């Protein structure tokens, strides 16, 4: 149970967009099982609505689409996997 502030909301949306990207890339290898493919499709549907909802609270210039957020998400995951800011500097800038 970790105390977090607002905008862990935004960050988690972005992070999980990156997660979706990984699932999608994994699926290209024919390695994602059928339950897994179901998890992927559901993530994408929950994500798209969550993004919809969330973009309504955001200021016009910072309402990003799923496609835009996957890019931030991938950056974040590179940082995490190497535990190195250098791996995705833009990850810190959402």
């Amino acid at each position: 149970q970790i105390e977090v502030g607002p905008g862990a909301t935004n960050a988690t949306i972005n992070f999980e967009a990156g997660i979706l990207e990984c699932y999608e890339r994994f699926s290209w290898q024919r390695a994602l099982d059928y339950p897994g493919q179901d998890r992927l499709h559901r993530l994408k549907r929950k994500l798209e609505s969550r993004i919809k909802t969330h973009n309504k609270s955001e200021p016009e210039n910072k309402r990003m689409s799923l496609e835009e957020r996957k890019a931030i998400g991938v950056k974040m995951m590179k940082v995490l996997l190497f535990m190195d800011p250098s791996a995705g500097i833009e990850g810190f800038e959402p």
Partner: protein, 153 residues
């Protein structure tokens, strides 16, 4: 100085520094502000992405008032075994975690060796371990050997 620390969510906070401050002092302030051990902090200069250099003055690596550093926290903390060798040269094995304080290890060694913890101190690669610091501050590795030193009275 006042320095900006930016974390992965994009959230920022400020830390108060000075011209004679080292990376170690910087990390100390960060621990003050957010409760993360210095050895678990991974820092780089924003936005170049250059890692901070431990031996080099902050001012000598492109930091100053108003600067921003990026922080990633690494809380990986799996158990490892280390050795503590007593005054007689017998080594004993201890399962520890790097987040555990030196005082914590001393309690373990104290029990095993039968010596009150105020009657010895520990050293690693020559340097004395400070009670309140986590083991990870000292870069202990699996099967590293720490030395028990007896306080003479």
């Amino acid at each position: 100085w006042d320095l900006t620390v930016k974390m992965l969510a994009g959230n920022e906070f400020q830390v108060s520094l000075s011209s004679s401050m080292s990376v170690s002092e910087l990390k100390a302030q960060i621990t003050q502000k957010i409760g993360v051990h210095a050895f678990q902090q991974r820092l780089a200069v924003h936005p170049s992405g250059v890692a901070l250099q431990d031996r080099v003055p902050l001012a000598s690596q492109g930091l100053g008032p108003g600067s921003t550093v990026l922080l990633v926290v690494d809380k990986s903390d799996e158990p490892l075994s280390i050795l503590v060798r007593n005054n007689k040269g017998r080594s004993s094995t201890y399962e520890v975690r790097l987040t555990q304080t030196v005082a914590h290890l001393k309690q373990q060694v104290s029990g095993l060796e039968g010596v009150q913890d105020d009657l010895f101190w520990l050293t690693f690669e020559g340097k004395p371990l400070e009670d309140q610091l986590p083991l990870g501050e000292y870069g202990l590795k699996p099967l590293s050997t720490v030395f028990m030193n007896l306080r003479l009275r």
